[PDB]
Amino acid sequence: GRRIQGQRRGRGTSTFRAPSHRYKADLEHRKVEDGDVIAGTVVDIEHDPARSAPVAAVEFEDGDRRLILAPEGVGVGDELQVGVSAEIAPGNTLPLAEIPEGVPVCNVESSPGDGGKFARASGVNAQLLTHDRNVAVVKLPSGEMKRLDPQCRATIGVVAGGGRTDKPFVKAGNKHHKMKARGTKWPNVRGVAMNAVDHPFGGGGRQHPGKPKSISRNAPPGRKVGDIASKRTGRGG
Amino acid sequence: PVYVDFDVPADLEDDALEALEVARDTGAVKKGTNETTKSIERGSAELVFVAEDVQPEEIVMHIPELADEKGVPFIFVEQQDDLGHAAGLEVGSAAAAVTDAGEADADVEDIADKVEELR
Amino acid sequence: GKKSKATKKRLAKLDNQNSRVPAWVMLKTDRRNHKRRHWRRNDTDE
Amino acid sequence: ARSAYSYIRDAWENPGDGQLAELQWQRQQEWRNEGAVERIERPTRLDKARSQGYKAKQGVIVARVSVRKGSARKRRHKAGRRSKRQGVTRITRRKDIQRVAEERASRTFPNLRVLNSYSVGQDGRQKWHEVILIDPNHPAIQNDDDLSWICADDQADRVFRGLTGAGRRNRGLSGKGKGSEKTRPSLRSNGGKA
RNA sequence: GCUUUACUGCAGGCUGUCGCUGAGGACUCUCACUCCGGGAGGAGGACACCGAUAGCCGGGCA
RNA sequence: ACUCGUACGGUCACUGAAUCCUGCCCAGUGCAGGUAUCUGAACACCUCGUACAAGAGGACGAAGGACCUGUCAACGGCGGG
RNA sequence: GCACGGAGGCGAAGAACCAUGGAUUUCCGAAUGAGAAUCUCUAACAAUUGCUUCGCGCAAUGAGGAACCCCGAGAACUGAAACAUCUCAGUAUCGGGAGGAACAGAAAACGCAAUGUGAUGUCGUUAGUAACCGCGAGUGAACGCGAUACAGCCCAAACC
Ligand SMILES: [Cl-]
Ligand SMILES: [Cl-]
Ligand SMILES: [Cl-]
Ligand SMILES: [K+]
Ligand SMILES: [Mg+2]
Ligand SMILES: [Mg+2]
Ligand SMILES: [Mg+2]
Ligand SMILES: [Mg+2]
Ligand SMILES: [Mg+2]
Ligand SMILES: [Mg+2]
Ligand SMILES: [Mg+2]
Ligand SMILES: [Mg+2]
Ligand SMILES: [Mg+2]
Ligand SMILES: [Mg+2]
Ligand SMILES: [Mg+2]
Ligand SMILES: [Mg+2]
Ligand SMILES: [Mg+2]
Ligand SMILES: [Mg+2]
Ligand SMILES: [Mg+2]
Ligand SMILES: [Mg+2]
Ligand SMILES: [Mg+2]
Ligand SMILES: [Mg+2]
Ligand SMILES: [Mg+2]
Ligand SMILES: [Mg+2]
Ligand code: NA
Ligand code: NA
Ligand code: NA
Ligand code: NA
Ligand code: NA
Ligand code: NA
Ligand code: NA
Ligand code: NA
Ligand code: NA
Ligand code: NA
Ligand code: NA
Ligand SMILES: [Sr+2]
Ligand SMILES: [Sr+2]
Ligand SMILES: [Sr+2]
Ligand SMILES: [Sr+2]
Ligand SMILES: [Sr+2]
Ligand SMILES: [Sr+2]
Ligand SMILES: [Sr+2]
Ligand SMILES: [Sr+2]
Ligand SMILES: [Sr+2]
Ligand SMILES: [Sr+2]
């Protein structure tokens, strides 16, 4: 047959690319030698096209002006700190080791110094649970207990823009506008609605997959469609 | 470095090259890794020098053990070009051998002894 | 359109080639410009 | 008596034992960080180099080249093929890696001509060979009784036509009798069946 | 052209084994190699990646 | 490529606004998990064979299968007496 | 000049014409200072190399050529009265490269087994033989022999 849409994606052609030339900045934590003698002032709150959430522009002591992944409750004028000795307040960054247990955090690094990988989406947060000299235990937004190096840096508080998901798009046109700001091909044509040549589910008088949807993990690209390695399906049981 | 099992003091290395310099003006000396090698094999060698800045190391890796199973004493020189200069060459020399000193036997003897001690 | 200096030289040459076979060449050879082109009926290169 | 050279030779008969073993373990760390073709002042295996024609003289160059290990890196058929011509994974190329190495080296030094080459080991993902190249335009060589032959016009780009020792072996030209019915005088003249 | 529990194969995924690969049926370590870090250094570690091969799945493809 | 993205994410599918609802079936097929025992290739190992080799057999046994379990808003099914 | 016009001119200061050698030889073009649909902008071996007086100072490469030649990549229609091994075929086509011819070449050969031959191409033959093969269709040498032409040498190491 013909390659399915999932396969066209990988080629990274314009249709499937993200509007990167329009994206603002990479919100990675600052790199500090040590001492925490790094503080800056929030000079402005901006809209981040890539995340549909707000970001804050900060002017640091040493003259560096950079955008930062802002938690909820940060405003212009406010002073932020980044370092081992940073103060324990919303909007401040410091290694998990310095963070008191039971404190919601965001933009958590996976490997100390990577700039932040976890909990960066609208209104989300990781929950610092356990401390130690060898391992910091964090509860990520998905509910998973993640063991991290206590040297992994993070920002106190939850990500701004929470609740974004609580309101329905209502119109196709609204989805449309959001989609234009992401690396995604939209709208979506169902596999069952295509010709046999275009998808495993295509073909047949009436629409219906002519096979079970739960596909094996070992299936090759082009065939891995539907419910991938489902451990179960439905709502029952 | 892989064939070097002990470090020689700058001062000892100094005396050796001096001895080697008078050895060529008085007695006899071999210049070059090949000639140095045949001397040890023919047993016609009293003291063999081996530079430490030799690349590739294969060129002189054999001198150490070969000398041991031949009783011939050997010493290391930090630089290749010094040994060549001391041997009286306009170029460098990865290894050298004093084939019978000359009015330096006393010194060459001490040098060999100072090494055995240095292990 | 906007013609470059070179394009212009070529266009000019084509215009010149578009002339007739001199009358004397007729007498001399004792009896056509096979490359006669028309701006409308034809199409030049570029 | 034994030449000092024989000791380098003897060391390389078992590159995985003795001092040579530790040298390779050390060196390869540096080699893995070098480029595809690195010129070197002196051969790593002197005995082999001199044996292959090397000389400490102007116009003689040595370069270490690395190539990825394994079989062919081929793309599966996009058009119809019978089971036989659908193979992709176990199909290997007809030129050995040493030959690929000789060619890359010669491309890097367009003016030089490949004289010979030899192996200097490998790790799990690549192989290294050192190639001896000669400057056919340098007088120190135009006047050398043992190398001036490589200055002739018909020796130009010799490696690309399989005129190298590795080239000739790979073309099945070693045997002078049985087995060389389709290799000599050329693979091509024999319909490419060798 | 299309389909599939038609025939025969081919990609691909899973898995064992051999090489890369080191020291002291379960284990410690560091030195290759990998990853994080501007760097110091940190994490991991003879595994993983990669080469070779074996078994299974394999209209994704011929 | 996704991705200047990180689960309030984005990938793969099905249904197709709101409203009231969405029953029964895990035997077969699919997916996933588990698995005492059974089955399960090659290398190495052992026996026989060969002054060697081919080869024959053995022991060990991964995934997989047998077997067990979960799962239908998974393929689908919901009859005759 | 082709080219048989008109006008005019050149040639005994030996023109025309022919051979050999030299002069001139715009721009783009491998195209090489940078750029560009044959032009433009502000001293140029661009790029990769060797040597090196370490300065582009001295040099090399690049692109072309009817096919021939050498090294790589490598189909299908087709035949088998289907078709998968096989065939078509190492063909078509593709990548790289040399020359006037290429390539091969002085035995770790041959094995008419010998008290024998004696580098290598090629031609005739050996022969559709040996060998291969759903042992189907088909594929298919060699040694030798008769010819052509003949030619044999140089390193590495030992010892210096
Ligand atoms: Cl969305
Ligand atoms: Cl060449
Ligand atoms: Cl004979
Ligand atoms: K065929
Ligand atoms: Mg960022
Ligand atoms: Mg878009
Ligand atoms: Mg749809
Ligand atoms: Mg339709
Ligand atoms: Mg239709
Ligand atoms: Mg399909
Ligand atoms: Mg339907
Ligand atoms: Mg006009
Ligand atoms: Mg000579
Ligand atoms: Mg020929
Ligand atoms: Mg990296
Ligand atoms: Mg098909
Ligand atoms: Mg519908
Ligand atoms: Mg509809
Ligand atoms: Mg130009
Ligand atoms: Mg047929
Ligand atoms: Mg064939
Ligand atoms: Mg038949
Ligand atoms: Mg054939
Ligand atoms: Mg024969
Ligand atoms: Na026109
Ligand atoms: Na070259
Ligand atoms: Na063959
Ligand atoms: Na069922
Ligand atoms: Na001219
Ligand atoms: Na040039
Ligand atoms: Na220069
Ligand atoms: Na037929
Ligand atoms: Na047919
Ligand atoms: Na066959
Ligand atoms: Na006869
Ligand atoms: Sr990042
Ligand atoms: Sr970064
Ligand atoms: Sr269908
Ligand atoms: Sr239910
Ligand atoms: Sr030198
Ligand atoms: Sr018109
Ligand atoms: Sr060339
Ligand atoms: Sr509804
Ligand atoms: Sr079931
Ligand atoms: Sr002859």
Domain A82-159 has CATH 3.40.1280.10: no
Rounded CA separation D176/D187 (Å): 14
CA distances from B53 to A152, B13, C40 (A): 45, 14, 83
Structure token digits, residue D149 = 């032959």
Which residue's C-alpha is at the least distance from the C1' of E52? D70
Residue A36 Cα distances to A29, A86, A109, A117, A151, angstroms: 13, 6, 17, 21, 14
Q: Where are the beta strands (DSSP E) in chain D?
A: 37-40, 60-68, 113-122, 126-134
The enclosing H or E element of C28 equals helix C23-28
- Closest by alpha carbon to A91, among A116, A108, A74, A112? A74
Residue owning tokens 């006899």: B28
Report the residue of chain B nearest D25, measured CA to CA.
B2
Element (H, E) at B96: strand B95-98
* D54 three-class SS: coil
Say whether B2 and D8 touch across the interface (CB within 8 A).
no
With contact defined as beta carbons under 8 Å apart, do A89 and A156 qualify? yes
* Closest Cα in chain D to B66: D7
Phi/psi of residue D134, nearest 5 degrees:
-125, 145
Cα gap A116→A95, rounded to integer Å: 11
In D32-173, which ranges are continuous DSSP H helix? Answer: 46-52, 97-108, 139-142, 165-170
Instruction: Please write down the long-range contacts of D92-95, taking CB distance under 8 Å and 24 or more positions apart.
Output: D94/D170, D95/D170
CB crowding A118-153: b at 16 or more within 10 Å, else e? bbbbbbbbbbbeeeeeeebbbbbbeeeebebebebb
Instruction: Tell me how many degrees the CA angle B14-B20-B26 measures, rounded to the nearest 5.
Output: 140
Query: Domain ranges in chain A?
Result: 1-78, 82-159, 160-237
D22 neighbourhood in chain B, CB within 8 Å: 2
With contacts defined as CB-CB under 8 Å, which chain D residues touch B55? 42
Place of tokens 């000892």: B12
* Structural domains in chain C, sorted by start: 1-46 (1.10.1620.10)
Lookup: nucleotide whose C1' is closest to D71 CA:
E51
Cα–Cα dist A18/A20, whole Å: 5
Q: How was this structure determined?
A: X-ray
Helix H or strand E segment including A155: strand A153-156
Give the integer Cα–Cα distance in Å for D120 and D101: 12
A160-237 topology per CATH: Ribosomal protein L2; domain 3 (4.10.950)
Q: Token pair of D38, please?
A: 């690195």
Closest-lying nucleotide for D193 based on CA to C1': G90
Residue D90 and residue D71 in contact, taking contact as beta carbons nearer than 8 Å: yes
Q: Residue B40: its chain D contacts at CB < 8 A?
A: none
Pairing, β A227-228 against β A53-60: unpaired
Pure H helices in chain B? 10-25, 33-42, 63-68, 80-86, 105-118
3-state secondary structure of C22: coil
Residues in Cβ contact with B6 at an 8 Å cutoff, skipping those fewer than 6 apart: B76, B118, B119
Of D4, D20, D44, nearest to B33 by CB-CB distance is: D4
Say whether B56 and D46 touch across the interface (CB within 8 A): yes
Task: Tell me if D136 sits within 8 A of D62, measured CB to CB.
Answer: no
Note whether B42 contacts D45, CB cutoff 8 Å.
no
Rounded distance between C-alpha atoms, residue B18 and residue A159, angstroms: 76
Report how far Cα D68 is from the mean position of its chain's Cα atoms: 14
d(CA C35, CA B44): 97
Length of chain A: 237
Instruction: Answer for D172: CB within 7 Å of strand G.
Output: no
For residue D97 the two structure tokens come to 């890696």
Closest residue to E38 (CA, C1′):
A31
Q: Which fold has domain A1-78?
A: OB fold (Dihydrolipoamide Acetyltransferase, E2P) (2.40.50)
Radius of gyration of chain A (CA): 22
Residues 6+ apart with CB under 8 A from A183: A16, A17, A18, A19
Phi, psi of A66 (to 5 degrees): -145, 155
CB A151 under 7 Å to nucleic chain E: yes
Question: Distance (Å) from CA B23 to C1' G73?
Answer: 65
Q: Which domain holds residue D145?
A: 1-194
Largest separation between any pair of C-alpha atoms in chain D? 66
Contact A65, A118 (CB under 8 A): no
Question: Is D26–B2 a contact, with Cβ atoms under 8 angstroms apart?
Answer: yes
In sequence order, what E strands does C1-46 have? none
Cα-flanking dihedrals φ and ψ of residue A169, to 5°? -65, -25
Task: Assess whether C31 (CB) lies less than 7 A from strand G.
Answer: no
Which nucleotide is closest to A219, CA to C1'?
E13
Among B69, B61, B77, B60, residue whose Cα is nearest residue B41: B69
Residue A57: CB atoms within 10 A of its CB come to 19
- Stated in angstroms to one decimal place, the resolution of this structure is 2.3
Residue of B58, B63, B66 for testing the chain D interface, max D β-carbons within 10 Å: B58
Contact D36, D44 (CB under 8 A): no
Q: Please, are residues D70 and D91 in contact by the beta-carbon 8 Å criterion? A: no
Domain count, chain D: 1
Residue among D1, D8, D20 whose CB faces B59 most closely: D8
Question: What domains sit in chain B, N to C, each tagged with a CATH number?
Answer: 1-119 (3.30.1330.30)
